[PDB]
């Protein structure tokens, strides 16, 4: 079958902006990132289904500092169409991530993995899909997780 | 103390002792696996995952061989000293329908 | 009236002196744990030793910094 991803950001925190901008090698990417405006649940769409899912995960956070949170999707299959839902809560993120994203100006990256065992090599997709640029103020100096 | 473990060898006393320290190893069934690996036969961990310079600092890139490993979760205190990491893609998958012990580079 | 089940145990202090008529009582702070555990966990581990067993439970904790 063919899948389609829908990453929905609840965004309890007010300020938020998704600005996908990356240039990488050919890793079986075929979709194009599109952002749909809405009131609260501002969902982003993708048709980036090129391999078969045996593991399907969304890694959010800072990769260069080894701060990764993993998210599991909600599957709904209708024949050929396999829709994936990726609920991302901006208030349920762990404090150790926000307390570091507030200070460091670097954006929080978000990539997804859709690999499988039987899939032939050099086509299992491992690509970056979002660069969230958080531009508000959070708490610090009181309960910092770095300590 | 030096201490070893594996999904084929998980002493209960060792698990309880480590849990008392702050380290949480995986249980018997769960085993780590990584599809993005140069050698499918066993686990090959790249020397780029070293996390603490004083223990061992790689003069040159190399590949450490592991087989049927079992990653561990770590609490957040000042005594624990992470020395190696697991590749971001890797994940622990148990035989039964139990949730994955550790996902991503957290293991 | 006072029953022995009333007073909870003291985990962070340890008695070092008390007079003949229990009038003046001198306690001492315990030295912080070497492994970094909270002394209440040490207390619950030493008073509840055999029966407090759980098979397997994935701990819920913040991602390692």
From Swiss-Prot, chain A:
Q: How does it sit in the membrane?
A: Multi-pass membrane protein
The Gene Ontology terms for molecular function here are: structural molecule activity
A Gene Ontology biological process term: protein N-linked glycosylation
Is Endoplasmic reticulum among this UniProt entry's keywords? Answer: yes
Which GO CC terms are listed, alphabetically? endoplasmic reticulum membrane; oligosaccharyltransferase complex
> Where, in residue ranges, is this chain on the Lumenal side?
1-147
The keyword Transmembrane helix is assigned to this record = yes
Name the domain of life: Eukaryota
Grouped into one coarse class, the protein's main location is endoplasmic reticulum
What is known about its subunit structure?
Component of the oligosaccharyltransferase (OST) complex, which appears to exist in two assemblies comprising OST1, OST2, OST4, OST5, STT3, SWP1, WPB1, and either OST3 or OST6. OST assembly occurs through the formation of 3 subcomplexes. Subcomplex 1 contains OST1 and OST5, subcomplex 2 contains STT3, OST3, and OST4, and subcomplex 3 contains OST2, WBP1, and SWP1. Interacts with SEC61 and SSS1.
Q: What other remark does the UniProt record contain for this protein?
A: Present with 8450 molecules/cell in log phase SD medium.
Q: What is this protein called?
A: Dolichyl-diphosphooligosaccharide--protein glycosyltransferase subunit SWP1
**Source species, please?**
Saccharomyces cerevisiae (strain ATCC 204508 / S288c) (Baker's yeast)
Upper classification of the source organism reads: Eukaryota, Fungi, Dikarya, Ascomycota, Saccharomycotina
Give the stretch of the parent protein shown, with its full length. Answer: 26 to 172 of 286
UniProtKB/Swiss-Prot annotation, chain B:
Where, per UniProt, does this protein localize?
A: Endoplasmic reticulum membrane
* Species whose genome carries this gene: Saccharomyces cerevisiae (strain ATCC 204508 / S288c)
Record's miscellaneous remark: Present with 14900 molecules/cell in log phase SD medium.
Summarize subunit and interaction data from the UniProt record for this chain.
Component of the oligosaccharyltransferase (OST) complex, which appears to exist in two assemblies comprising OST1, OST2, OST4, OST5, STT3, SWP1, WPB1, and either OST3 or OST6. OST assembly occurs through the formation of 3 subcomplexes. Subcomplex 1 contains OST1 and OST5, subcomplex 2 contains STT3, OST3, and OST4, and subcomplex 3 contains OST2, WBP1, and SWP1. Interacts with SEC61, SBH1 and SSS1.
Family (UniProt)? Belongs to the DDOST 48 kDa subunit family.
What top-level branch of life does the organism fall under? Answer: Eukaryota
In terms of the whole protein, what range is present?
109 to 215 of 430
Q: Which cysteines are joined by disulfide bonds?
A: none
Q: What is the lineage of its organism?
A: Eukaryota, Fungi, Dikarya, Ascomycota, Saccharomycotina
Q: What is this protein called?
A: Dolichyl-diphosphooligosaccharide--protein glycosyltransferase subunit WBP1
Q: Provide the domain comment.
A: The cytoplasmic C-terminal domain contains a functional dilysine-retrieval motif, which is involved in the retrograde Golgi-to-ER transport of the protein.
Q: Which function does this protein serve?
A: Subunit of the oligosaccharyl transferase (OST) complex that catalyzes the initial transfer of a defined glycan (Glc(3)Man(9)GlcNAc(2) in eukaryotes) from the lipid carrier dolichol-pyrophosphate to an asparagine residue within an Asn-X-Ser/Thr consensus motif in nascent polypeptide chains, the first step in protein N-glycosylation. N-glycosylation occurs cotranslationally and the complex associates with the Sec61 complex at the channel-forming translocon complex that mediates protein translocation across the endoplasmic reticulum (ER). All subunits are required for a maximal enzyme activity.
From Swiss-Prot, chain C:
**Subcellular location field:** Endoplasmic reticulum membrane
Q: Domain of life, per the record?
A: Eukaryota
Region (Disordered): which ranges?
41-65
Q: How does it assemble?
A: Component of the oligosaccharyltransferase (OST) complex, which appears to exist in two assemblies comprising OST1, OST2, OST4, OST5, STT3, SWP1, WPB1, and either OST3 or OST6. OST assembly occurs through the formation of 3 subcomplexes. Subcomplex 1 contains OST1 and OST5, subcomplex 2 contains STT3, OST3, and OST4, and subcomplex 3 contains OST2, WBP1, and SWP1. Interacts with SEC61.
Q: Which family does it belong to?
A: Belongs to the STT3 family.
Role summary = Catalytic subunit of the oligosaccharyl transferase (OST) complex that catalyzes the initial transfer of a defined glycan (Glc(3)Man(9)GlcNAc(2) in eukaryotes) from the lipid carrier dolichol-pyrophosphate to an asparagine residue within an Asn-X-Ser/Thr consensus motif in nascent polypeptide chains, the first step in protein N-glycosylation. N-glycosylation occurs cotranslationally and the complex associates with the Sec61 complex at the channel-forming translocon complex that mediates protein translocation across the endoplasmic reticulum (ER).
Record remark: domains:
Despite low primary sequence conservation between eukaryotic catalytic subunits and bacterial and archaeal single subunit OSTs (ssOST), structural comparison revealed several common motifs at spatially equivalent positions, like the DXD motif 1 on the external loop 1 and the DXD motif 2 on the external loop 2 involved in binding of the metal ion cofactor and the carboxamide group of the acceptor asparagine, the conserved Glu residue of the TIXE/SVSE motif on the external loop 5 involved in catalysis, as well as the WWDYG and the DK/MI motifs in the globular domain that define the binding pocket for the +2 Ser/Thr of the acceptor sequon.
């Amino acid at each position: 079958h063919v899948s389609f991803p829908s990453t929905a950001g609840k965004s309890r925190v007010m300020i938020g902006k998704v600005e996908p901008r990356i240039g990488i090698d050919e890793t079986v990417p075929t979709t194009i990132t599109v952002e749909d405006p809405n009131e609260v649940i501002q969902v982003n769409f993708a048709i980036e289904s090129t391999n078969k899912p045996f593991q399907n995960t969304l890694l959010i956070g800072l990769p260069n500092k080894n701060l990764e949170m993993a998210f599991e999707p909600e599957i709904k299959d209708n024949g050929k169409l396999s829709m994936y839902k990726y609920r991302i809560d901006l208030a349920k993120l762990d404090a150790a991530l926000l307390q570091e994203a507030s200070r460091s100006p670097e954006p929080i990256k978000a990539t997804l993995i859709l690999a499988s065992s039987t899939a032939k090599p050099k086509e299992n997709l491992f690509r970056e899909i979002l660069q969230l640029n958080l531009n508000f103020d959070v708490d610090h100096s009181d309960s910092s997780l770095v300590d | 103390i030096l201490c070893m473990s594996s999904p084929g060898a998980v002493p209960n006393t060792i698990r309880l002792f480590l849990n008392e320290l702050g380290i949480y190893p995986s249980p018997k069934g769960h085993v780590i696996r990584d599809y993005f690996s140069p050698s499918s036969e066993e686990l090959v961990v790249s020397s780029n995952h070293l996390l603490n310079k004083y223990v061992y600092n790689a003069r040159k890139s190399e590949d450490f061989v592991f087989g049927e490993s079992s990653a561990a979760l770590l609490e957040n205190r000042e005594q624990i000293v992470p020395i190696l990491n697991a590749p971001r893609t890797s994940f622990t998958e148990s035989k039964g329908k139990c949730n994955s012990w550790t996902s991503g580079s957290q293991g | 009236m006072i029953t022995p089940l009333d007073v909870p145990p003291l985990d962070y202090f340890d008695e070092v002196f008390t007079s003949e008529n229990w009038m003046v009582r001198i306690y001492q702070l315990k030295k912080d744990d070497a492994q970094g555990r909270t002394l209440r966990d040490v207390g619950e581990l030493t008073r509840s030793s055999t029966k407090t067993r759980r098979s397997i439970k994935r701990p819920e904790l913040g991602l390692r910094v």
